[PDB]
């Protein structure tokens, strides 16, 4: 009936709710096809193409996003969708089929299921950034 998984990036958080339904997918109350940067639209569509249309007809997905920027928000949504489909199968379908799907997403890449640990570094006085120092003159 219902699960809730999240995906994360630098400061973006995406929460996906997966239920039984008729096939809809929506983001912040619009279709997925209104995600803004068009050149990055293939990222969101990757997991849907791998598993196929066969296993996803009977589900509805809702996603909310908060924080970050253009690129980080897109990447968090990929992770939310991929993890959510996996967890829905664990709870309401046999898990031997779940293992087969988790194999499929892994042979393409990780980071469809594993978060990224990189994070911004603080700055220190005596320079402009974390490493760059003010120019010395002699």
């Amino acid at each position: 009936k219902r699960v809730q998984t999240f995906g994360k990036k630098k400061t973006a958080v995406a929460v996906a709710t997966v239920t039984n339904g008729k096939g809809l997918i929506k983001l912040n109350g619009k279709n997925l096809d209104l995600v803004e940067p068009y050149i990055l639209k293939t990222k969101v569509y990757e997991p849907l193409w791998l598993i196929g249309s066969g296993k996803l007809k009977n589900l509805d997905i809702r996603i909310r996003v908060k924080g970050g920027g253009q690129t980080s928000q897109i990447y968090a949504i990929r992770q939310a969708i991929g993890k959510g489909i996996i967890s829905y199968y664990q709870k309401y379908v046999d898990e031997s089929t779940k293992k087969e799907l988790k194999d499929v997403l892994l042979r393409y890449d990780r980071s469809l299921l594993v978060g990224d640990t990189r994070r911004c570094e603080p700055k220190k006085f005596g320079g402009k950034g974390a490493r760059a120092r003010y120019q010395k003159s002699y």
């Binding site: 109350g29 997925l32 096809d33 849907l48 249309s53």
Partner: protein, 165 residues
């Protein structure tokens, strides 16, 4: 019901998708296609007028040049109607922050700027006479009436039917 024609439709709006769609409200139509297509509608049917004075003003401090489209008044107004759907109770200060751009200050560093208010106010006043927006007796700002919301929604469903069918 609507016989008018839709503005130029680029490709890449026609690629197949791996899910299923709906088209009931304006949250289901491309933002750029709606704004341009509906802007012609207001001009053609004479629903608002382009204030004479607006023929020789710029939209904000940080522009330093005129809009150079001679249809900017209607295009901007039609985007305000879409915005009021997304945020109900909105004033003039909100719309000054919405249409902001950066201002180049000579040899000094750049900053963000703010749009002019008389243009924004005059559009909101005209739409009240047309009966599409109302000023709330409750809290604040001004939202869409029932007539305004219905007119916006109906055009959106027409646009989608013109593309995919």
């Amino acid at each position: 019901q609507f016989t008018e024609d839709i503005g130029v439709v680029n490709k890449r709006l026609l690629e197949p998708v791996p899910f299923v769609k709906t088209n009931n409200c304006i949250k289901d139509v491309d933002a750029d296609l709606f704004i341009r297509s509906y802007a012609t509608h207001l001009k053609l049917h004479n629903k608002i007028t382009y204030p004479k004075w607006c023929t020789f003003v710029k939209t904000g401090k940080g522009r330093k040049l005129a809009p150079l489209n001679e249809d900017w008044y209607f295009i901007r107004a039609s985007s305000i109607l879409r915005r009021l759907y997304l945020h109900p109770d909105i004033g003039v200060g909100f719309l000054r922050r919405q249409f902001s751009s950066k201002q180049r200050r000579g040899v000094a560093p750049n900053h963000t700027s703010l749009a002019s208010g008389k243009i924004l106010r005059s559009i909101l006043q005209q739409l009240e006479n047309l009966g599409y927006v109302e000023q709330n007796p409750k809290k604040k700002g001004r939202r869409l009436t029932t007539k305004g919301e219905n007119a916006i929604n109906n055009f959106a469903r027409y646009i989608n039917k013109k593309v995919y069918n």
